A = this chain, B = another copy of it.
Amino acid sequence: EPSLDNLAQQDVAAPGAPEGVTALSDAQYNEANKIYFERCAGCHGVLRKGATGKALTPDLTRDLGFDYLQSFITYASPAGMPNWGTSGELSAEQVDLMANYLLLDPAAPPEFGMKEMRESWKVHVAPEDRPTQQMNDWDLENLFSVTLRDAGQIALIDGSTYEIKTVLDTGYAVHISRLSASGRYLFVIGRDGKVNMIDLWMKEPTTVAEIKIGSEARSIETSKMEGWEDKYAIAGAYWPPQYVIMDGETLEPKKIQSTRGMTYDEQEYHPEPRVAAILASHYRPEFIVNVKETGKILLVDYTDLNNLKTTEISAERFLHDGGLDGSHRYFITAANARNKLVVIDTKEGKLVAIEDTGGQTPHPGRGANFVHPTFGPVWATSHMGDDSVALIGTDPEGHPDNAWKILDSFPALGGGSLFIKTHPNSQYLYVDATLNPEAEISGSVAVFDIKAMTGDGSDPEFKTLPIAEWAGITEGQPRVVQGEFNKDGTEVWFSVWNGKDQESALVVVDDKTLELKHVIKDERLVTPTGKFNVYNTMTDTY
């Protein structure tokens, strides 16, 4: 569940206390408010309307009373509520503050529309003043854009020499980097809703435009339909619940759409549907937008923004991440809280199937496409809740009997996995275990030989790569996360994510031998997490 710390840093005036409630001073309220958005709003919602956790609105809390709230916040619950008090995570004083805060009127966060976006919109280098051709001698397609999380920066690293070409400041922790279809523009989205556009053709690449699109955001994508290269970029926010279509060269906000609506199943109004993953169709000039809480997938046609055509597909609640199959026609996405994979046909714009993975909390990232020796084309995902890896058939025409069925499920290193990865030129399938409590596991990666798979019910064995050990890092609990290949698919990189004041690293593995190749360590390499190779990102190769 998300931490909405940028919303937390918002200062609000303390509301008055109604009948039977004690009032908090502006200082007490604000202290409690920051805690709420940083630690509770992810599960309970910004508006306290509920998401993973129950609703905590005044009408409900005032009936429960101070003592009930105080105890629950203190001791937690087995159902999922954390023991803030007994764990020592929150002081006795803060627990009381939270209990009081919950009895008061919810702080209504501000909206953020066109006026607000335009005020934050800054074009540093006008399109006219930009290069007409690449002015640096870098191999752009083999460049890696790495998130230096806590430092609010990104590093551009050379894919063949491993030289850190440049470290750029964005102002706040970014979540991901995405590339325009031409590979010229790099877009980074900050957790604070800040979008930075970087021109990779300049002698010294730098931000040529920036804009804010909300208070909390995690996703962005570029137009990838042939004929629409560099035309648009779209960003989605957690708060306010909306997505925004922007000009692909200036970041000028063109269209803002609210995601507030009815849940697909119960058809009950939901005031806070967060935008999760956003992908771009290769079959139609459309963006694919996941709306989490309502369980809807939107196919947004960008050929006409005034007479806007959209297809709202009823899927499954708690949609998060996902990716396209090998042919780029089908979108496969995880409804994580419900252990389901939803398959969408982007050519026809319809729901194809919804399958239970048999695992707990699938989290594929964009997933991994490969041709299984016996099953044919499949897409794979690992899970956060357990050690299982599941395969789903993705070839309706060639292997009709295997299409959209979970063909196999087998264990990898352990629970806490976040990313699975492969490349068309590789015969290996890499699976991490980032969130595993055991250091030996979270610092390692499991590797399966695809060519050795038989799908005869037996569990395929895997090799364990001690990534953290190879990096020479033992201080703190380094967590290895996300494999990402170079342009050729001959080398795969992993982040050895350590604390802000600890030593981190990036480990390059030779895909053909599964041996350590190179370790990147540098003082500026603070909390490296997501890494994105320009070529693989712009072409959706995974």
> Is B16 a contact of A26 with CB atoms below 8 Å?
no
In the bound complex, what is the Cα–Cα distance between A114 and B262 (angstroms)?
A: 9
- Interface flags, A1-38, vs B, CB<8A=1, else 0: 00000000000111111111101011000000000000
Report the minimum CB–CB distance from A413 to chain B (whole Å): 38
Chain B minimum-CB-distance residue to A118: B267
Instruction: Contacts A261-B258, A312-B308 given; indicate if A111 touches B16 (C-beta within 8 A).
Output: no
A136 within 8 A of B: no
Q: Which residues of B contact A256 (CB under 8 A)?
A: 262, 267
- Interface flags, A107-126, vs B, CB<8A=1, else 0: 00001011100000000000
* Other A-B pairs beyond A15-B18, A309-B310, 11, CB < 8 Å: A13-B57, A13-B62, A15-B105, A16-B104, A16-B105, A113-B262, A115-B266, A115-B268, A258-B269, A260-B261, A309-B309
> Is A26 a contact of B15 with CB atoms below 8 Å?
no
Which A residues from 46 to 77 make CB contacts under 8 A with B? 57-59, 62
Q: Which residues of B contact A16 (CB under 8 A)?
A: 15-19, 21, 23, 104-105
Which single member of B14, B253, B260, B311 contacts A260 (CB below 8 Å)?
B260
Instruction: Contacts A15-B15, A16-B23, A19-B25 given; indicate if A306 touches B310 (C-beta within 8 A).
Output: no
Instruction: Contacts A115-B266, A262-B256 given; indicate if A14 touches B19 (C-beta within 8 A).
Output: yes
A490 within 8 A of B: no
Which A residues from 163 to 216 make CB contacts under 8 A with B? none
> Is A350 a contact of B304 with CB atoms below 8 Å?
yes
> Is A257 a contact of B261 with CB atoms below 8 Å?
yes
A307 within 8 A of B: yes
Which A residues from 306 to 346 make CB contacts under 8 A with B? 306-314
Nearest 7 A/B pairs, CB to CB: A16-B16, A114-B267, A13-B58, A113-B268, A13-B59, A307-B350, A16-B17
> Is A308 a contact of B306 with CB atoms below 8 Å?
no
A478 within 8 A of B: no
Query: By CB atoms of chain B within 10 A, which of A19, A114, A313 has the most?
Result: A19
A240 within 8 A of B: yes
In the bound complex, what is the Cα–Cα distance between A127 and B306 (angstroms)?
A: 42
In the bound complex, what is the Cα–Cα distance between A311 and B242 (angstroms)?
A: 18
> Is B23 a contact of A18 with CB atoms below 8 Å?
yes
A152 within 8 A of B: no
Chain B minimum-CB-distance residue to A244: B267
In the bound complex, what is the Cα–Cα distance between A16 and B23 (angstroms)?
A: 8
Report the minimum CB–CB distance from A288 to chain B (whole Å): 13
Q: Which residues of B contact A262 (CB under 8 A)?
A: 113-114, 242, 256-258
A-side interface residues, number (CB < 8 Å) = 50
In the bound complex, what is the Cα–Cα distance between A306 and B350 (angstroms)?
A: 8
A351 within 8 A of B: yes
Chain B minimum-CB-distance residue to A104: B16
A349 within 8 A of B: yes
Q: Which residues of B contact A25 (CB under 8 A)?
A: 19
> Is A310 a contact of B307 with CB atoms below 8 Å?
no
Query: By CB atoms of chain B within 10 A, which of A16, A26, A115, A314 has the most?
Result: A16
Q: Which residues of B contact A260 (CB under 8 A)?
A: 258, 260-261
18 pairs of residues in contact across A and B, judged by CB atoms under 8 Å: A13-B59, A14-B19, A16-B16, A16-B18, A16-B21, A16-B23, A16-B105, A17-B18, A19-B26, A113-B262, A113-B269, A114-B266, A256-B267, A257-B261, A304-B350, A306-B350, A307-B351, A309-B309
Q: Which residues of B contact A242 (CB under 8 A)?
A: 262, 269
In the bound complex, what is the Cα–Cα distance between A42 and B339 (angstroms)?
A: 45
Q: Which residues of B contact A19 (CB under 8 A)?
A: 14, 16, 23, 25-26
Q: Which residues of B contact A59 (CB under 8 A)?
A: 12-13
Query: By CB atoms of chain B within 10 A, which of A59, A115, A312, A349 has the most?
Result: A312
Q: Which residues of B contact A58 (CB under 8 A)?
A: 13
Q: Which residues of B contact A255 (CB under 8 A)?
A: 267
In the bound complex, what is the Cα–Cα distance between A50 and B180 (angstroms)?
A: 41
> Is A349 a contact of B23 with CB atoms below 8 Å?
no
In the bound complex, what is the Cα–Cα distance between A306 and B353 (angstroms)?
A: 13
Report the minimum CB–CB distance from A267 to chain B (whole Å): 4
In the bound complex, what is the Cα–Cα distance between A528 and B314 (angstroms)?
A: 44
In the bound complex, what is the Cα–Cα distance between A225 and B248 (angstroms)?
A: 39
Which single member of B111, B267, B304, B311 contacts A309 (CB below 8 Å)?
B311
Query: By CB atoms of chain B within 10 A, which of A15, A25, A256, A269 has the most?
Result: A269
In the bound complex, what is the Cα–Cα distance between A261 and B111 (angstroms)?
A: 12
Report the minimum CB–CB distance from A303 to chain B (whole Å): 11
Q: Which residues of B contact A258 (CB under 8 A)?
A: 260-262, 269
Q: Which residues of B contact A15 (CB under 8 A)?
A: 15-16, 18, 105
In the bound complex, what is the Cα–Cα distance between A313 and B310 (angstroms)?
A: 11
Instruction: Contacts A16-B18, A18-B16, A266-B113 given; indicate if A314 touches B309 (C-beta within 8 A).
Output: no
